[PDB]
Ligand binder design. Structure first.
Ligand SMILES: Nc1ncnc2c1ncn2[C@@H]1O[C@H](C[C@@H](N)CC[C@H](N)C(=O)O)[C@@H](O)[C@H]1O
Length: 283
């Protein structure tokens, strides 16, 4: 790989500063979700709005990684209820947890109102990973449902699956919530998917229009990220693995809270990475 010297990785989509014409690890998908959701919830923990909240995770099955998330915050003493909702059955490793409710159901508008009624007036934190290859109509339906999740559940914060339709498959302009577009380490080699992280103030979710020219910008920026940036070795990075994804993961993991104290920040991240990899059965 090509060597590079970096002070920090690209954490959000806006930071990608170049574009390029578009042209491995075991169970990487669970690792990708685990890192992004740890980053999202740890950010909420820093703001002091995670404690006392109920995390409603829609599209959570199989959700093997969710067991690690729950244990992590449980071992920190953070008071969270988990509500996992999916039409498919969850990983059995989530069984036997009293603070985790497993719901076997595909959510629609009517059901979203019911769960809001039972959880109200408690704080709701929304995580959506629903997916129905997917067509642009499938994505538009998914993003429409995620908008309905926010307008009905009215969460204090949300993490939403966000991948813009390809410009050569455009149908119509559509609307998505305001938020920060978190980039995902250990995503598929050429995935353009990101997570939309939103914290709602005055609970007025302002919607932004997405256009075909936005789709072109997403495609070219993400291809540059996947083809060039993620194939670099960060030679100044002090870590056993200097590949960009580990450099990217390192910066996400240093937002995580830990009960254990460590002599150095590197030791903490190394411990966290070993812990996450061991649970997910990654060498
Ligand atoms: N309307 C819906 N309500 C709930 N779950 C849905 C809906 N549409 C699709 N899904 C689920 O979304 C899931 C998509 C998965 N890629 C999610 C993986 C999951 N987040 C994991 O941690 O392993 C599937 O299990 C679908 O059953």
């Amino acid at each position: 790989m090509d060597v590079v010297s970096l002070d920090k990785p690209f954490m959000y989509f806006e930071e990608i500063d170049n574009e390029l014409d578009y042209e491995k690890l075991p169970y990487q998908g669970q690792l990708k979700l685990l890192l992004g959701e740890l980053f999202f919830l740890s950010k909420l923990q820093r703001h002091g709005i995670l404690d006392g909240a109920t995390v409603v995770y829609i599209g959570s099955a199989p959700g093997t990684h969710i067991r690690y998330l729950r244990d992590h915050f449980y071992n920190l003493g953070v008071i969270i209820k988990w509500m996992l909702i999916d039409g498919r059955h969850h990983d059995p490793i989530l069984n036997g947890l009293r603070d985790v409710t497993l719901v076997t159901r595909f959510v629609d508008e009517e059901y979203l109102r019911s769960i809001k009624k039972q959880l109200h007036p408690s704080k709701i934190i929304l995580i959506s990973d629903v997916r129905s290859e997917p067509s642009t109509a499938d994505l538009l339906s998914n993003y429409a449902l995620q908008n309905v999740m926010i307008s009905i559940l009215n969460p204090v914060a949300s993490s939403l699956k966000w991948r813009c339709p390809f410009p050569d498959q455009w149908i119509k302009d559509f609307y998505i919530p305001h938020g920060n577009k978190m980039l995902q380490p250990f995503a598929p080699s050429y995935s353009a998917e990101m997570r939309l992280l939103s914290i709602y103030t005055g609970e007025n979710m302002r919607l932004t229009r997405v256009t075909k020219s936005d789709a072109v910008n997403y495609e070219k920026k993400m291809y540059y990220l996947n083809k060039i940036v993620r194939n670099k070795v960060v030679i100044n990075f002090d870590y056993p693995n200097q590949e960009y994804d580990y450099f990217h993961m390192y910066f996400m993991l240093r937002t995580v809270y830990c009960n254990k104290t460590f002599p150095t920040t590197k030791a903490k991240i190394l411990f966290l990475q070993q812990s996450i990899f061991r649970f997910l059965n990654i060498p």
